[PDB]
């Protein structure tokens, strides 16, 4: 939905604006070091990603 | 781009939001005390940002 921008959809994903490992890269260090830099919420759904924060 | 007539999504610099070095320096406070403000995020364009951080 990024290579045509028409969708524009994040209505069902399981942690927002990760895309890359180096997105992923950037978003630990958002959460470990208090941070929270926050154009990466956790939206509610995915259970397993909860239990790994 | 303020100068200019079309915005195009600013083009996606390093780091979003800075455009002086006073706003380098708001960033530094915002990114190491853990104020986190979530304004003026990261992306992953350049990695040297994240060396730096």
Known sequence: ???????????????????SFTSAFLFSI??????GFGGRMMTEECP????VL
Chains 1, 2 share one sequence.
Request: net charge neutral; aromatic share 0%; charged share 20%.
């Open 1 to 19: 939905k990024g290579i045509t921008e028409k969708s524009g959809l994040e209505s069902a994903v399981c942690v927002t604006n990760v895309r």
């Open 30 to 35: 958002e959460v470990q070091v208090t941070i």
């Open 48 to 51: 397993l990603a909860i239990t």
